[PDB]
Paper text:
Sequencing and annotation of the P. falciparum genome has supported the identification of new blood-stage vaccine candidate antigens, among which the P. falciparum Cysteine-Rich Protective Antigen (PfCyRPA) has a number of noteworthy properties. PfCyRPA is part of a multi-protein complex including also the PfRH5-interacting protein PfRipr and the reticulocyte binding-like homologous protein PfRH5, which binds to the erythrocyte receptor basigin. Moreover, PfCyRPA-specific monoclonal antibodies (mAb) inhibit parasite growth both in vitro and in vivo by blocking merozoite invasion. Here, we describe the crystal structure of the promising vaccine candidate PfCyRPA alone and in complex with the antigen-binding fragment (Fab) of the parasite growth inhibitory mAb c12.
The parasite inhibitory anti-PfCyRPA c12 mAb binds tightly to PfCyRPA with a Kd of ca. 1 nM as determined by surface plasmon resonance analysis. This mAb recognizes PfCyRPA independent of its glycosylation, as revealed by Western blot analyses. Because of these favorable properties, we chose c12 for epitope mapping by determining the structure of a PfCyRPA/c12 complex. In a first step, we determined the crystal structure of c12 in isolation. We obtained three different crystal forms containing a total of four crystallographically independent Fab molecules. (B) Overview of the c12 structure with a glycan located at heavy-chain Asn37. mFo-DFc electron density for the glycan is shown as a red mesh drawn at the three rmsd level. The four c12 molecules superimpose onto their variable VHVL di-domains with an average rmsd of 0.35 Å, which reveals a minor spread of the elbow angles between 133.1° and 135.8°. The high structural congruence indicates that the CDR conformations are genuine and not dominated by crystal contacts. Third, consistent with the similar conformations of the CDR loops in the individual c12 Fab structures there are negligible conformational changes in the c12 CDR loops when bound to PfCyRPA.
Author numbering:
A (entry chain A): 15 to 236
B (entry chain B): 25 to 237
The structure:
Protein backbone atom coordinates (compact mmCIF):
# COMPACT_ATOMS: atom_id res chain seq x y z
CA UNK A 1 0.00 0.00 0.00
CA UNK A 2 2.37 2.59 -1.36
CA UNK A 3 2.89 5.73 0.71
CA UNK A 4 5.16 8.76 0.90
CA UNK A 5 5.47 11.41 3.64
CA UNK A 6 7.69 14.48 3.23
CA UNK A 7 9.11 16.22 6.30
CA UNK A 8 11.38 19.00 7.36
CA UNK A 9 9.61 21.90 5.72
CA UNK A 10 9.28 25.30 7.32
CA UNK A 11 10.61 28.84 7.43
CA UNK A 12 14.26 29.50 6.50
CA UNK A 13 16.34 32.69 6.17
CA UNK A 14 17.57 33.81 2.72
CA UNK A 15 21.08 32.43 2.17
CA UNK A 16 20.41 29.61 4.60
CA UNK A 17 20.08 25.85 4.64
CA UNK A 18 17.36 23.26 5.20
CA UNK A 19 17.08 19.47 4.94
CA UNK A 20 13.86 17.84 3.72
CA UNK A 21 13.15 14.13 4.20
CA UNK A 22 10.66 11.69 2.71
CA UNK A 23 9.57 8.45 4.40
CA UNK A 24 8.48 5.70 2.04
CA UNK A 25 6.55 2.54 2.87
CA UNK A 26 4.52 -0.11 1.09
CA UNK A 27 7.17 -1.05 -1.46
CA UNK A 28 10.75 -2.16 -1.90
CA UNK A 29 12.28 1.32 -1.68
CA UNK A 30 15.66 -0.08 -2.73
CA UNK A 31 14.24 -1.19 -6.11
CA UNK A 32 12.92 2.18 -7.34
CA UNK A 33 14.33 5.42 -8.71
CA UNK A 34 13.16 8.44 -6.67
CA UNK A 35 12.90 12.14 -7.45
CA UNK A 36 11.91 15.62 -6.18
CA UNK A 37 9.84 18.40 -7.70
CA UNK A 38 8.36 21.60 -6.42
CA UNK A 39 5.51 23.99 -7.05
CA UNK A 40 5.75 27.69 -6.29
CA UNK A 41 2.69 29.73 -5.28
CA UNK A 42 0.49 30.13 -8.34
CA UNK A 43 2.80 28.45 -10.85
CA UNK A 44 3.55 25.23 -12.70
CA UNK A 45 5.41 22.15 -11.51
CA UNK A 46 9.16 22.05 -11.66
CA UNK A 47 11.47 19.07 -11.84
CA UNK A 48 14.32 19.33 -9.32
CA UNK A 49 16.17 16.05 -9.73
CA UNK A 50 16.35 12.24 -9.55
CA UNK A 51 18.43 9.41 -7.96
CA UNK A 52 18.76 5.73 -8.95
CA UNK A 53 18.36 2.97 -6.35
CA UNK A 54 22.13 2.61 -5.89
CA UNK A 55 22.92 6.32 -5.59
CA UNK A 56 25.42 5.86 -8.47
CA UNK A 57 23.46 8.22 -10.72
CA UNK A 58 22.17 11.61 -9.53
CA UNK A 59 20.93 14.36 -11.83
CA UNK A 60 19.72 17.92 -11.27
CA UNK A 61 18.03 20.74 -13.17
CA UNK A 62 20.89 23.13 -14.09
CA UNK A 63 19.93 26.06 -11.80
CA UNK A 64 20.00 23.85 -8.74
CA UNK A 65 23.04 21.62 -9.33
CA UNK A 66 25.26 23.67 -7.02
CA UNK A 67 22.72 24.52 -4.28
CA UNK A 68 20.80 21.30 -3.82
CA UNK A 69 22.05 17.83 -3.05
CA UNK A 70 19.92 14.67 -3.36
CA UNK A 71 20.64 11.55 -1.29
CA UNK A 72 19.02 8.39 0.04
CA UNK A 73 19.41 5.64 2.64
CA UNK A 74 17.82 2.39 1.50
CA UNK A 75 18.17 1.03 5.02
CA UNK A 76 15.88 3.76 6.34
CA UNK A 77 13.52 3.90 3.40
CA UNK A 78 14.25 7.58 3.31
CA UNK A 79 14.94 10.09 0.53
CA UNK A 80 16.67 13.42 1.32
CA UNK A 81 17.07 16.92 -0.08
CA UNK A 82 19.74 19.30 1.18
CA UNK A 83 18.89 22.85 0.27
CA UNK A 84 21.51 25.54 0.56
CA UNK A 85 21.96 29.21 -0.42
CA UNK A 86 18.20 29.64 -0.68
CA UNK A 87 16.41 32.71 -2.09
CA UNK A 88 12.72 33.50 -2.40
CA UNK A 89 12.78 31.70 -5.76
CA UNK A 90 12.88 28.52 -3.66
CA UNK A 91 9.69 29.26 -1.73
CA UNK A 92 7.39 26.45 -2.89
CA UNK A 93 5.68 23.20 -2.00
CA UNK A 94 8.21 20.38 -2.15
CA UNK A 95 7.18 16.94 -3.48
CA UNK A 96 8.99 13.68 -3.46
CA UNK A 97 7.90 11.13 -6.03
CA UNK A 98 8.60 7.56 -7.01
CA UNK A 99 9.50 6.68 -10.61
CA UNK A 100 7.34 3.96 -12.11
CA UNK A 101 9.09 0.74 -13.08
CA UNK A 102 10.84 1.13 -16.43
CA UNK A 103 9.76 4.73 -16.90
CA UNK A 104 11.21 8.10 -16.12
CA UNK A 105 7.70 9.15 -15.04
CA UNK A 106 6.56 9.89 -11.51
CA UNK A 107 4.41 7.03 -10.36
CA UNK A 108 3.32 8.22 -6.95
CA UNK A 109 3.59 11.67 -5.37
CA UNK A 110 3.80 12.54 -1.68
CA UNK A 111 1.51 15.19 -0.09
CA UNK A 112 4.36 17.68 -0.11
CA UNK A 113 6.11 19.80 2.49
CA UNK A 114 5.89 23.62 2.36
CA UNK A 115 9.10 25.68 2.38
CA UNK A 116 9.16 29.49 2.85
CA UNK A 117 12.26 31.62 2.35
CA UNK A 118 11.94 34.83 4.32
CA UNK A 119 13.49 37.32 6.70
CA UNK A 120 10.13 37.87 8.47
CA UNK A 121 9.34 36.20 11.81
CA UNK A 122 7.17 33.29 12.91
CA UNK A 123 3.81 34.51 14.29
CA UNK A 124 0.99 32.47 15.83
CA UNK A 125 -2.57 32.92 14.45
CA UNK A 126 -5.46 34.55 16.27
CA UNK A 127 -8.53 32.35 15.98
CA UNK A 128 -12.05 33.82 16.11
CA UNK A 129 -15.42 32.02 16.27
CA UNK A 130 -18.06 33.64 14.05
CA UNK A 131 -21.68 33.17 15.07
CA UNK A 132 -24.65 34.35 12.99
CA UNK A 133 -26.15 37.82 13.29
CA UNK A 134 -27.74 38.41 16.71
CA UNK A 135 -31.35 38.61 15.60
CA UNK A 136 -31.76 34.90 14.94
CA UNK A 137 -34.37 34.14 12.27
CA UNK A 138 -35.45 30.61 11.44
CA UNK A 139 -34.31 29.46 8.01
CA UNK A 140 -33.76 25.84 7.02
CA UNK A 141 -30.04 26.08 7.50
CA UNK A 142 -27.44 28.04 9.40
CA UNK A 143 -23.89 28.99 8.47
CA UNK A 144 -20.98 29.45 10.90
CA UNK A 145 -17.48 30.80 10.40
CA UNK A 146 -14.01 30.47 11.74
CA UNK A 147 -11.51 33.27 11.17
CA UNK A 148 -7.74 32.65 11.35
CA UNK A 149 -5.86 35.94 11.32
CA UNK A 150 -2.24 37.14 11.34
CA UNK A 151 0.07 34.09 11.22
CA UNK A 152 3.36 33.30 9.46
CA UNK A 153 4.36 31.33 7.61
CA UNK A 154 2.12 28.87 5.79
CA UNK A 155 0.55 26.42 6.34
CA UNK A 156 -2.27 26.40 8.83
CA UNK A 157 -4.66 23.44 9.08
CA UNK A 158 -8.37 23.85 9.86
CA UNK A 159 -11.09 21.30 10.62
CA UNK A 160 -14.52 21.19 12.16
CA UNK A 161 -15.18 18.93 15.14
CA UNK A 162 -11.81 17.31 14.68
CA UNK A 163 -12.74 16.33 11.13
CA UNK A 164 -16.09 14.60 11.66
CA UNK A 165 -17.89 17.55 10.17
CA UNK A 166 -16.72 17.55 6.54
CA UNK A 167 -19.83 18.24 4.45
CA UNK A 168 -20.94 21.83 3.88
CA UNK A 169 -17.50 23.12 4.64
CA UNK A 170 -15.69 25.81 2.65
CA UNK A 171 -12.09 26.67 3.61
CA UNK A 172 -10.66 29.56 1.55
CA UNK A 173 -7.09 30.08 0.29
CA UNK A 174 -5.04 32.23 2.69
CA UNK A 175 -4.22 35.78 1.65
CA UNK A 176 -0.99 37.67 2.48
CA UNK A 177 -0.92 41.10 4.07
CA UNK A 178 2.37 42.71 5.19
CA UNK A 179 4.19 39.51 6.12
CA UNK A 180 1.04 38.01 7.70
CA UNK A 181 -1.52 35.51 6.42
CA UNK A 182 -5.26 35.50 7.08
CA UNK A 183 -7.66 32.62 6.39
CA UNK A 184 -11.37 31.83 6.98
CA UNK A 185 -13.75 28.87 6.83
CA UNK A 186 -17.52 28.42 6.73
CA UNK A 187 -19.60 25.37 7.62
CA UNK A 188 -23.29 25.01 6.88
CA UNK A 189 -25.51 22.68 8.87
CA UNK A 190 -29.26 22.28 9.24
CA UNK A 191 -30.81 24.36 12.00
CA UNK A 192 -31.92 21.37 14.09
CA UNK A 193 -28.23 20.50 14.36
CA UNK A 194 -26.97 23.82 15.76
CA UNK A 195 -26.97 25.15 18.41
CA UNK A 196 -28.54 21.96 19.84
CA UNK A 197 -25.24 20.19 19.05
CA UNK A 198 -21.79 21.78 19.37
CA UNK A 199 -19.56 22.97 16.60
CA UNK A 200 -15.90 23.68 17.17
CA UNK A 201 -13.20 24.70 14.76
CA UNK A 202 -9.73 23.27 15.28
CA UNK A 203 -6.70 25.14 14.03
CA UNK A 204 -3.06 24.02 13.94
CA UNK A 205 -0.03 26.14 13.02
CA UNK A 206 2.96 23.80 13.23
CA UNK A 207 5.67 26.40 12.69
CA UNK A 208 4.65 28.02 16.02
CA UNK A 209 3.44 24.86 17.79
CA UNK A 210 -0.08 26.30 18.05
CA UNK A 211 -3.06 24.02 18.55
CA UNK A 212 -6.17 26.08 19.24
CA UNK A 213 -9.92 25.29 19.36
CA UNK A 214 -12.90 27.67 19.37
CA UNK A 215 -16.40 26.58 20.25
CA UNK A 216 -19.11 28.39 18.38
CA UNK A 217 -22.20 29.51 20.27
CA UNK A 218 -25.01 32.00 19.63
CA UNK A 219 -24.31 35.68 20.35
CA UNK A 220 -25.82 37.10 23.51
CA UNK A 221 -25.48 37.08 27.35
CA UNK A 222 -24.09 34.45 29.77
CA UNK B 1 17.18 22.30 -21.92
CA UNK B 2 13.86 21.26 -23.41
CA UNK B 3 10.79 23.47 -23.21
CA UNK B 4 7.30 21.96 -23.19
CA UNK B 5 4.64 24.35 -24.44
CA UNK B 6 1.16 23.48 -23.33
CA UNK B 7 -2.10 24.86 -24.78
CA UNK B 8 -4.63 25.95 -24.08
CA UNK B 9 -3.99 27.38 -20.62
CA UNK B 10 -7.70 27.34 -19.77
CA UNK B 11 -10.70 25.26 -20.84
CA UNK B 12 -14.34 25.68 -19.88
CA UNK B 13 -16.44 22.91 -21.13
CA UNK B 14 -19.73 21.17 -20.60
CA UNK B 15 -20.16 17.69 -19.12
CA UNK B 16 -20.04 15.13 -21.94
CA UNK B 17 -17.84 17.21 -24.22
CA UNK B 18 -14.53 16.04 -25.66
CA UNK B 19 -11.42 18.12 -25.01
CA UNK B 20 -7.91 17.98 -26.43
CA UNK B 21 -4.81 19.48 -24.88
CA UNK B 22 -1.64 20.02 -26.89
CA UNK B 23 1.98 19.89 -25.79
CA UNK B 24 4.84 21.03 -28.03
CA UNK B 25 8.49 20.21 -27.28
CA UNK B 26 11.36 22.43 -28.32
CA UNK B 27 13.32 19.37 -29.58
CA UNK B 28 12.51 15.77 -30.53
CA UNK B 29 11.71 13.71 -27.43
CA UNK B 30 10.76 10.42 -29.15
CA UNK B 31 7.70 8.87 -27.47
CA UNK B 32 8.73 9.83 -23.94
CA UNK B 33 5.91 12.04 -22.78
CA UNK B 34 3.84 11.65 -19.62
CA UNK B 35 0.59 13.35 -18.54
CA UNK B 36 -0.54 14.19 -15.00
CA UNK B 37 -3.73 15.40 -13.33
CA UNK B 38 -3.66 17.48 -10.18
CA UNK B 39 -7.02 17.84 -8.48
CA UNK B 40 -7.59 20.72 -6.07
CA UNK B 41 -5.94 20.06 -2.72
CA UNK B 42 -4.32 16.94 -4.05
CA UNK B 43 -0.98 15.72 -5.38
CA UNK B 44 -0.49 14.78 -9.04
CA UNK B 45 -1.59 11.37 -10.23
CA UNK B 46 -0.07 9.84 -13.39
CA UNK B 47 -2.46 9.17 -16.31
CA UNK B 48 -0.56 8.70 -19.55
CA UNK B 49 3.02 7.59 -20.05
CA UNK B 50 5.15 7.03 -23.17
CA UNK B 51 2.78 9.30 -25.03
CA UNK B 52 -0.09 6.80 -25.36
CA UNK B 53 -0.36 4.30 -22.50
CA UNK B 54 -2.87 4.46 -19.67
CA UNK B 55 -1.40 3.84 -16.24
CA UNK B 56 -3.01 1.15 -14.08
CA UNK B 57 -6.51 2.07 -12.89
CA UNK B 58 -6.85 5.02 -15.22
CA UNK B 59 -10.32 5.00 -16.90
CA UNK B 60 -11.01 4.68 -20.65
CA UNK B 61 -11.95 8.34 -21.15
CA UNK B 62 -8.26 9.17 -21.01
CA UNK B 63 -6.07 8.87 -24.06
CA UNK B 64 -2.89 10.22 -25.48
CA UNK B 65 -1.00 10.28 -28.72
CA UNK B 66 2.00 11.92 -30.27
CA UNK B 67 5.57 11.53 -31.38
CA UNK B 68 8.63 13.75 -31.96
CA UNK B 69 7.56 17.25 -30.93
CA UNK B 70 3.72 17.07 -31.08
CA UNK B 71 1.70 15.39 -28.32
CA UNK B 72 -1.92 15.39 -27.35
CA UNK B 73 -3.99 14.41 -24.39
CA UNK B 74 -7.65 13.67 -24.71
CA UNK B 75 -10.66 13.22 -22.50
CA UNK B 76 -13.42 11.71 -24.61
CA UNK B 77 -16.31 12.40 -22.24
CA UNK B 78 -15.60 15.03 -19.55
CA UNK B 79 -17.09 14.47 -16.11
CA UNK B 80 -17.35 16.90 -13.20
CA UNK B 81 -14.96 14.78 -11.14
CA UNK B 82 -12.40 15.40 -13.91
CA UNK B 83 -12.04 19.00 -12.75
CA UNK B 84 -8.28 19.43 -12.21
CA UNK B 85 -5.15 21.02 -13.63
CA UNK B 86 -3.50 18.88 -16.36
CA UNK B 87 0.18 19.09 -17.27
CA UNK B 88 2.67 17.23 -19.49
CA UNK B 89 6.27 16.13 -19.05
CA UNK B 90 9.05 14.94 -21.33
CA UNK B 91 11.26 12.29 -19.75
CA UNK B 92 13.43 11.71 -22.81
CA UNK B 93 16.34 13.48 -21.18
CA UNK B 94 17.40 15.33 -18.06
CA UNK B 95 16.21 17.78 -16.94
CA UNK B 96 12.83 15.98 -17.19
CA UNK B 97 10.72 19.12 -17.61
CA UNK B 98 7.07 19.97 -17.13
CA UNK B 99 4.63 21.91 -19.29
CA UNK B 100 2.86 24.91 -17.78
CA UNK B 101 -0.49 23.21 -17.31
CA UNK B 102 -4.11 23.56 -18.45
CA UNK B 103 -6.91 24.35 -16.03
CA UNK B 104 -10.16 22.51 -16.62
CA UNK B 105 -13.52 23.82 -15.38
CA UNK B 106 -17.05 22.56 -16.03
CA UNK B 107 -20.32 24.19 -17.01
CA UNK B 108 -23.50 23.75 -15.04
CA UNK B 109 -26.85 25.51 -14.48
CA UNK B 110 -26.70 29.09 -13.18
CA UNK B 111 -26.93 29.26 -9.37
CA UNK B 112 -27.50 32.22 -7.04
CA UNK B 113 -25.07 32.68 -4.16
CA UNK B 114 -26.11 31.84 -0.63
CA UNK B 115 -24.96 34.87 1.36
CA UNK B 116 -24.24 35.27 5.11
CA UNK B 117 -22.73 38.23 7.02
CA UNK B 118 -20.87 38.15 10.33
CA UNK B 119 -20.27 40.90 12.87
CA UNK B 120 -16.83 40.85 14.48
CA UNK B 121 -16.30 38.00 16.85
CA UNK B 122 -16.98 38.70 20.50
CA UNK B 123 -13.45 37.48 21.11
CA UNK B 124 -11.83 39.99 18.73
CA UNK B 125 -12.82 43.56 19.63
CA UNK B 126 -10.65 43.55 22.75
CA UNK B 127 -7.45 43.40 20.65
CA UNK B 128 -8.44 46.72 19.07
CA UNK B 129 -9.24 45.33 15.64
CA UNK B 130 -12.56 44.55 13.97
CA UNK B 131 -13.25 42.18 11.05
CA UNK B 132 -16.61 41.90 9.33
CA UNK B 133 -16.81 38.69 7.33
CA UNK B 134 -19.12 37.84 4.43
CA UNK B 135 -19.55 34.38 2.86
CA UNK B 136 -20.84 33.91 -0.68
CA UNK B 137 -21.25 30.18 -1.14
CA UNK B 138 -22.28 27.82 -3.97
CA UNK B 139 -22.86 29.94 -7.04
CA UNK B 140 -22.32 29.68 -10.82
CA UNK B 141 -20.91 31.26 -12.94
CA UNK B 142 -17.73 32.29 -11.20
CA UNK B 143 -17.74 36.02 -11.78
CA UNK B 144 -19.25 37.93 -8.90
CA UNK B 145 -18.84 41.35 -7.30
CA UNK B 146 -19.01 42.42 -3.66
CA UNK B 147 -19.60 45.97 -2.31
CA UNK B 148 -19.26 46.92 1.33
CA UNK B 149 -21.56 49.66 2.51
CA UNK B 150 -21.22 51.43 5.83
CA UNK B 151 -24.20 53.62 6.75
CA UNK B 152 -24.98 53.91 3.05
CA UNK B 153 -21.46 54.74 1.77
CA UNK B 154 -19.54 52.14 -0.22
CA UNK B 155 -16.27 51.24 1.47
CA UNK B 156 -13.35 49.90 -0.58
CA UNK B 157 -10.27 50.15 1.72
CA UNK B 158 -9.49 47.18 3.91
CA UNK B 159 -11.25 44.58 1.77
CA UNK B 160 -9.73 41.13 1.19
CA UNK B 161 -11.33 38.51 -0.99
CA UNK B 162 -10.45 34.85 -1.43
CA UNK B 163 -11.92 32.30 -3.82
CA UNK B 164 -12.27 28.59 -3.71
CA UNK B 165 -11.55 26.48 -6.75
CA UNK B 166 -14.60 24.98 -8.37
CA UNK B 167 -16.12 22.13 -6.31
CA UNK B 168 -16.33 18.72 -8.02
CA UNK B 169 -19.31 17.76 -5.84
CA UNK B 170 -21.71 20.33 -7.31
CA UNK B 171 -19.52 22.22 -9.79
CA UNK B 172 -19.89 25.52 -7.84
CA UNK B 173 -17.71 28.37 -6.52
CA UNK B 174 -17.52 30.12 -3.21
CA UNK B 175 -16.03 33.40 -2.09
CA UNK B 176 -15.08 35.01 1.18
CA UNK B 177 -14.82 38.77 1.80
CA UNK B 178 -13.38 40.50 4.89
CA UNK B 179 -13.53 44.16 5.85
CA UNK B 180 -10.82 45.15 8.35
CA UNK B 181 -11.37 48.21 10.52
CA UNK B 182 -9.84 49.41 13.73
CA UNK B 183 -12.21 48.94 16.67
CA UNK B 184 -12.66 52.71 16.67
CA UNK B 185 -13.76 52.95 13.02
CA UNK B 186 -16.18 50.10 13.73
CA UNK B 187 -17.77 51.73 16.79
CA UNK B 188 -18.50 55.03 15.04
CA UNK B 189 -21.04 53.54 12.60
CA UNK B 190 -24.10 51.36 13.11
CA UNK B 191 -25.06 49.49 9.94
CA UNK B 192 -22.84 47.21 7.84
CA UNK B 193 -23.88 45.86 4.45
CA UNK B 194 -22.61 42.98 2.34
CA UNK B 195 -23.79 43.31 -1.26
CA UNK B 196 -23.59 40.61 -3.96
CA UNK B 197 -24.07 41.24 -7.67
CA UNK B 198 -24.35 38.19 -9.96
CA UNK B 199 -25.99 37.55 -13.35
CA UNK B 200 -28.58 35.28 -11.74
CA UNK B 201 -30.38 38.33 -10.46
CA UNK B 202 -31.11 41.81 -11.54
CA UNK B 203 -30.91 43.33 -8.05
CA UNK B 204 -27.97 42.74 -5.70
CA UNK B 205 -28.34 40.31 -2.81
CA UNK B 206 -28.15 42.31 0.42
CA UNK B 207 -27.32 40.88 3.83
CA UNK B 208 -27.04 43.47 6.50
CA UNK B 209 -26.85 44.16 10.24
CA UNK B 210 -26.84 46.77 13.02
CA UNK B 211 -24.03 47.15 15.57
CA UNK B 212 -26.49 47.44 18.45
CA UNK B 213 -29.28 44.91 18.23
C1 LIG C 1 21.74 18.50 6.54
O1 LIG C 1 22.27 17.22 6.36
C2 LIG C 1 23.68 17.20 6.15
C3 LIG C 1 24.04 15.79 5.72
O2 LIG C 1 23.49 14.80 6.59
C4 LIG C 1 24.38 17.68 7.42
O3 LIG C 1 25.77 17.83 7.14
C5 LIG C 1 26.64 16.79 7.65
O4 LIG C 1 26.79 16.90 9.07
C6 LIG C 1 27.75 15.99 9.62
C7 LIG C 1 27.61 16.05 11.12
O5 LIG C 1 26.92 14.92 11.62
C8 LIG C 1 29.13 16.38 9.11
O6 LIG C 1 30.14 15.57 9.71
C9 LIG C 1 29.14 16.23 7.60
O7 LIG C 1 30.38 16.70 7.11
C10 LIG C 1 28.00 17.03 6.95
N1 LIG C 1 27.89 16.69 5.54
C11 LIG C 1 27.77 17.60 4.57
C12 LIG C 1 27.66 17.07 3.17
O8 LIG C 1 27.75 18.81 4.81
C13 LIG C 1 23.84 19.04 7.86
O9 LIG C 1 24.26 19.32 9.19
C14 LIG C 1 22.30 19.11 7.83
N2 LIG C 1 21.87 20.49 7.95
C15 LIG C 1 20.85 20.89 8.73
C16 LIG C 1 20.54 22.36 8.70
O10 LIG C 1 20.23 20.11 9.44
Amino acid sequence: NVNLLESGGGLVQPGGSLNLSCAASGFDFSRYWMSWARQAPGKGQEWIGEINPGSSTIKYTPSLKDKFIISRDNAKNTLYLQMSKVSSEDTALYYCARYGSYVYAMDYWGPGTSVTVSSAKTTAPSVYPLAPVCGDTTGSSVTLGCLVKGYFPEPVTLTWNSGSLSSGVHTFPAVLQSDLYTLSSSVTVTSSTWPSQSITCNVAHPASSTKVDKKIEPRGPT
Amino acid sequence: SIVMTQTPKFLLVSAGDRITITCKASQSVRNDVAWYQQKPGQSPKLLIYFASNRYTGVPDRFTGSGSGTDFTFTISTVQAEDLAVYFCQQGYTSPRTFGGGTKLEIKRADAAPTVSIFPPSSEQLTSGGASVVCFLNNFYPKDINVKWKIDGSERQNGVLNSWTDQDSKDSTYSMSSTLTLTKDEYERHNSYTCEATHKTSTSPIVKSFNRNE
